[PDB]
């Protein structure tokens, strides 16, 4: 671990310039899908920020990140961080993001080894984790699905950010 990056990175973009949207909540399971949000645009590289706000128990979080070659030429230099998600996340230490094991952050958290019979890892498209029934103190951690370095003609991909703001719930 011990990898270091920042929200803005090389995009040279401010938080006010982000295009912020909330997760498509689907009953117990909240979802942040970047399938169509990161394709190279002419006005790129934009920044898409998906905000997941869990204020209730036993919420499953699912994050979709398109893969190298799912479509041709449009996700070639795609990178997802942390590479060992969801078991590793990103926290705000100082103003620079650092890697942390998610089980240390939240206790009782349950990560299924497989998702639809394939590994629970961004390398297979999607990651999932089920928050426990009790969270004692507010926690925030981030994921990254960044296609900003992918260039097609004059277009450039976007950088995807997943903010997971968990508030205290339970006794």
């Amino acid at each position, epitope marked *: 671990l011990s990898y270091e990056t920042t929200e803005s990175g090389d995009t040279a973009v401010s938080e006010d310039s982000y295009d912020k949207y909330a997760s498509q909540n689907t009953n117990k399971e909240y979802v942040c899908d970047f399938t169509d949000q990161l394709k190279p645009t002419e006005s790129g590289p934009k920044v898409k920020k998906c905000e997941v706000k869990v204020n209730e128990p036993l919420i499953k979080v699912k994050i979709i990140c398109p893969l190298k*070659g799912s*479509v*041709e*030429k449009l996700y070639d230099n795609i990178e997802y961080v942390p590479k060992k998600s969801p078991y590793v996340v990103l926290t705000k230490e100082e103003t620079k993001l650092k890697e942390k094991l998610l089980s240390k952050l939240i206790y009782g958290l349950l990560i299924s080894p497989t998702v639809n019979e394939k590994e629970n890892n961004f390398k297979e498209g999607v990651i999932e984790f089920t928050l426990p029934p009790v969270v004692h103190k507010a926690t925030v951690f981030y994921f990254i699905c960044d296609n900003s370095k992918t260039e097609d003609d004059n277009k450039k991909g976007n950088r995807g950010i997943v903010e997971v703001y968990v508030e205290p719930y339970g006794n």
Partner: single-chain antibody
Framework: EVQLVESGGGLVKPGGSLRLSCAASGFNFISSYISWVRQAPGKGPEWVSS????????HYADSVKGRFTISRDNAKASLFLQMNSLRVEDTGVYYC???????????????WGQGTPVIVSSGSDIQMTQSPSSVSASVGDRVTITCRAS??????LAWYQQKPGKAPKLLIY???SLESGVPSRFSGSGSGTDFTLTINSLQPEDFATYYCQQAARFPITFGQGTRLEIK
């Protein structure tokens, strides 16, 4: 029972036209990514064209751009390649092969059709090199095939087996990972630009041609293959 069947092959003269069709059965065609892949005489496979399931994003190879047109019909689980302004270099077997994601990439092919031949006659990119060109070897020996890329591709390299008369079949992905069912004698190794395939003990069924393929960046690319012959 995944099945892809090609049709439309024939003989045409330079400048002529032809139309290929691929019939699919045994899987969800609406969620599948299917490409056309041709193999000319004495050459390894060459990606030609692909189309997303929604038909929104289409891509062609440079050699066939402006002369070929791809299309699909989800309801009838069919894929069409309309070939116009055909040239002698367009001669070869034309496959339709499904795309699947293995490891990190989806620049890999799961199932191939039998291939419909196309005869055209009247009388920048990653170059993959391979070595040797052919080996003949006894049962129980050790053979090592090499594959060199013209650009860095990390471990995004696959190996395909093509037994005489049949389509290729993926054996290794990620340079060193074995697909389901591949025997243990098959070994993969390498990273960056130089890669290697090794069969520790040659059994009679290993008789075939082995192609390497970079799954790193568009466009997909194969090597010229290495023929392996068991004596």
């Amino acid at each position: 029972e995944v099945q892809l069947v090609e049709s439309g092959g024939g003989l045409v003269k330079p400048g002529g036209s032809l139309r290929l069709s691929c019939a699919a059965s045994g899987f969800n065609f609406i969620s599948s990514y299917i490409s056309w892949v041709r193999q000319a005489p004495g050459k390894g496979p060459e990606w030609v064209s692909s189309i997303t399931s929604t038909s929104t994003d289409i891509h062609y190879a440079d050699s066939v751009k402006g002369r070929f047109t791809i299309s699909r019909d989800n309801a009838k689980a069919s894929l069409f390649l309309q070939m116009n302004s055909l040239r002698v270099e367009d001669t070869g077997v034309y496959y339709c092969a499904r795309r699947y994601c293995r490891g990190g990439t989806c620049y890999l092919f799961d199932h191939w059709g039998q291939g419909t031949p196309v005869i055209v006659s009247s009388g920048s990119d990653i170059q993959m090199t391979q070595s040797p060109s052919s080996v003949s070897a006894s049962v129980g020996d050790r053979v090592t095939i090499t594959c060199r890329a013209s650009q860095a591709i990390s471990s995004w390299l696959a190996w395909y087996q093509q037994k005489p008369g049949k389509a290729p079949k993926l054996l290794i992905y990620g340079a060193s990972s074995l697909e389901s069912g591949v025997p243990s004698r098959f070994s993969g190794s390498g990273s960056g630009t130089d890669f290697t395939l090794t069969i520790n003990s040659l059994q009679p069924e290993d008789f075939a041609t082995y192609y390497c393929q970079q799954a790193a960046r568009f466009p997909i690319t194969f090597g010229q293959g290495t023929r392996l012959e068991i004596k």
